[model samples]
Target chain A: PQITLWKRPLVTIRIGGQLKEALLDTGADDTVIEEMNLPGKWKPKMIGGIGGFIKVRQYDQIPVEIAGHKAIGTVLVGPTPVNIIGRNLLTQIGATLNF
Target chain B: PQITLWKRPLVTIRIGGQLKEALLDTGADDTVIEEMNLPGKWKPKMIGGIGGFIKVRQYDQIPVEIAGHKAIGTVLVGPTPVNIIGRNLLTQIGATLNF
Candidate 1:
């Protein structure tokens, strides 16, 4: 059974010189920052897809912190978003996930 | 610490007479399916969002099955892109999530 942890520690993220709180997710694969929350000045660079260069996409890199630990990583930016905390961070946190 | 459940049970879903396997995401709030997988038919009906009718949007209501259970709900379907299963299903499954 999973224990619910509401009031999980809030991490600070900056946008337009303002700090905000985001949920920490262990299931994500990449460091994900909500695209809708980014500043307009930082334009994401588009890159070709992994196989066959069949498609091209774009993303951004952002700096963030969790539980007094910090790391900078590339996160895919989108037009509209909910939330994404990525998988690498969980590995960093020494977490193991079920399902 | 969490235990990893690989090879978890996958549910069957049918689109255009084709059956495909999908993850049973108990954390999802709605019965989400990949819109890209849908056949050319099944035109989605746009429904109004909650309260005050500002910023009107549209979505699709899809039929789905889960672990021998099934239901029809209005799911927000979009183009190409990603997958989303919502919070409502979690209640049905009695899943507990920790952040």
Candidate 2:
């Protein structure tokens, strides 16, 4: 499937059986979601962005569905101002930038 | 041209005859660049992001070249934490996300 760059590219995604909307941020290196509940052990990690570093929980092998495509990988839960689906998950879903 | 989602999607862009690298941030609603010399009068405006809102100078119909494709439209200049190439410019170049 192809998603045209109309404006701020946002898509509905399901993670841990919960649906949420997230920005498809190619600038972000990892997928960071607003704090959410997951049923597995996670490691504490820090992520840096335009503002600064924020503490987050990195849960590995989390299943995510983006626009109905299934993907399993790391999911970072933190106090993110926005829910961002980054390159980490984007690559797994074979996402690319085309012009 | 096609860009694979390896990591942060940084690309070289030319604006006001100056070249710089900018992040392709779909999360950002508007394109924002770091402070640079641009001709003509600009309107003052505020843009919000993950952290907070910041004052910016909005210049309309400015010429911009992203990855060699020409785009002329609104370009915001301010004390942005990062130079971001938002959908405002990406759509001009017919960029899209494909999987």
Candidate 3:
């Protein structure tokens, strides 16, 4: 399905068997989710964005569902201002910036 | 033109007769540029993003060229971490988020 670029292109996504809404952030390099519990091996990492850098738990090879599309990749859980679905998983879903 | 959502969708944009690369941020609501010399009537404003809120100069109906497409809308000039092309101008250029 095609999503129009409104103020913020936000959509529902499922991760770790839980449903959540995240902004489709082309400006972000990694997918940053609000602090959530997940059963996986992860390491502490830091990421920078518009605001500043934040500490995150980088989990590898996690399953994610975006608009009915299944994807598996890194999922960062941390104290993020907003849930951001970055290009890491967007590429798996064949997401494109179209005009 | 259709651009794939890479790590960061950086593209060259012309604003105020100056060319600069800006991130095509679907997560951003308004276009924000790094502090630059702009000749227009503007008012003080503030915007929040991944990092935090910052002051900006909001200029109305300024001409902006993105990916060879002509667009005119509010352009925010301020001390931003990066140049961000938000939906305000993306809408005018018929940009879309596709997968």
Candidate 4:
């Protein structure tokens, strides 16, 4: 039986007043403000991503965490215009990602 | 010259915690909570609406205001999963509503 093991995130934050479970992605490049999570004071930027060039902004700092590890530095906030998980954050935690 | 003027609402609540201007709703039967704003610990109830009987829950007191007018009773908090303004409060204020 091929069973998918899922781990519930231990912590979360309000994204546009909605809650979303945080995931530990060592492959993520930076702390991201998911499209739906964007708040005021953020300007949407047009940038390239897994889906090719798209309108996305790299927020300076938005607090986020996954389990025991945490990201405290500035993160890309808001107006991503898309849902993305980048590697900018993994570089900070020195985490090893498993395929 | 004539104009259909509008008033900016002065009070608001964190719908899920995001800022949204409040509207004076004198005709509504009860205070309503937006579904997107639903938090945990709420039970969803089936109710009739433009979209059919959707799941919802009423918050006892959700602080809100419109300009100088205000509503200060337990409001229907989350799990309606939709934005609503209602009449239970108007009854308390002893004020008249205009179309």
Candidate 5:
């Protein structure tokens, strides 16, 4: 499937048995999702602090489906303003940017 | 031209008679570059105030070339962490996301 950039490239994604909408962000290096209870062991981490550290949980080798395309990678759970599917999974799903 | 998601999807861009590398962000609604001097009138704006508003200069009807493709749009100049080419300009260049 091909998509235009007229609007935010929102796509349906399934992770940890839950379905959610996410943005296809090529600028972001890693995938980040909203704070959700993901089953399995996760490591505590911090990223991009303003006044203090913003704590987040990182789940490794998690299975995900982007628009029905299969991918397994690390998914960071944090207080993200939006759900983002970055290059990590975009590569596995064979997504590309074309002009 | 087509780019894979193996790494950051970076491309050459020319704006305000200056050339720079930028990321093509499908998630961003507007394009924002680093604080640069453009020979034109610009408006001031406050965006995403965490502790203080991130003040940025907005230049409208500016001409830019993304990977040699021509476009004209509003460009926000600020203390941006990185140069991002968003949908505003990506659409003008006929860029698309494909799988």
Candidate 6:
């Protein structure tokens, strides 16, 4: 699929058996989603953003289906305003930027 | 050119006749950069992110070159952690996401 950048590059993602919307963020290094309940224990983590830094829970080796493609990686659940599918997961999904 | 998500898609951009590096952020709606001096009059604006919102100066029709592609659009000048080339300028330069 080829997605033009005229609007926010948001897509459907299935994670933890839940459907959610996330933006494909080429700018971010790690994938971050809104805080949620998922099976398994997570480690405490802190991430920095445009405004400042915030603490989050990092879950590893979780399976996520993005835009119909399945991928497993480290997903951070945090107080992010919008769910972000960053480079870590994007690479697993074989996503790229073209010009 | 095709850029893989294995690395940050940082490119050289020419804005205000100065060269700087920027990340191609598909998740951002507007292009935001670190506080810099730009020509012409601008209006005060506020934008939100994963953390919160911050005040910025909005300059319209500002000329910027992304990876040698020239474009003009609304650019926000503020205290951003990194220079972001958002959807606005991405569309102008015909940047796209592919899987």
For all candidates in order, the CA lDDT equals 0.40, 0.86, 0.87, 0.41, 0.86, 0.92
Candidate number with greatest lDDT: 6
Residue pairs with clashing backbones, model 1: A28-A87, B28-B85, B28-B86, B28-B87, B29-B86, B29-B87, B29-B88, B30-B86, B30-B87
Model 1 chain A scores worst on lDDT over the 10 consecutive residues at A48-57
Tens digits of per-residue lDDT for model 5, B28-98: 78888888899899999755511234678999999999998999999988977778888999999999999
i-RMSD values for every candidate model: 9.7, 1.9, 1.4, 26.4, 3.5, 0.9
lDDT by residue (B14-62, candidate 1, tens digit) is 5334555654433233344455454323444432211111121223445
lDDT of 4 by residue, B7-96 (tens): 211135444445665443322345665544444455444544222344456544555553334556545544443345455654454433
Residues A1-99 of candidate 1 have per-residue lDDT tens digits of 243322232345543344556544432345444445555344444322111111112344455555445645555555313334555554544433322
Lowest summed lDDT window (length 10), candidate 3 chain A: A46-55
DockQ of each: 0.11, 0.64, 0.77, 0.01, 0.57, 0.86
Candidate 2 local lDDT, A45-68, one digit each (tens): 988765557788999999999998
> What's each prediction's clash count?
9, 0, 1, 29, 0, 0
Write one digit per residue (lDDT tens) for candidate 3, span A1-99: 777875578889999888998898888788889999899789999887656677899999998999899999898999887789989999999999888
Candidate 2 docking classification: medium
Candidate 2: share of reference interface contacts reproduced: 0.72
Model 1 DockQ reads 0.11
Better of 3 and 6 by TM-score: 6
After superposing candidate 4, which stretches have Cα over 4 Å from the reference? A1-99, B1-18, B36-43, B77-82
Model 5 misplaced stretches (Cα beyond 4 Å): A49-53, B49-53
Ranking, lDDT, top scorer first:
6, 3, 2, 5, 4, 1
Model 3, span B1-99: residue lDDT tens:
888865578999998889999998888889999999899789999888655677899999999999999999999999888999998998899888887
True contacts kept of each: 0.13, 0.72, 0.85, 0.00, 0.73, 0.90
> Which candidate number has the best TM-score?
6
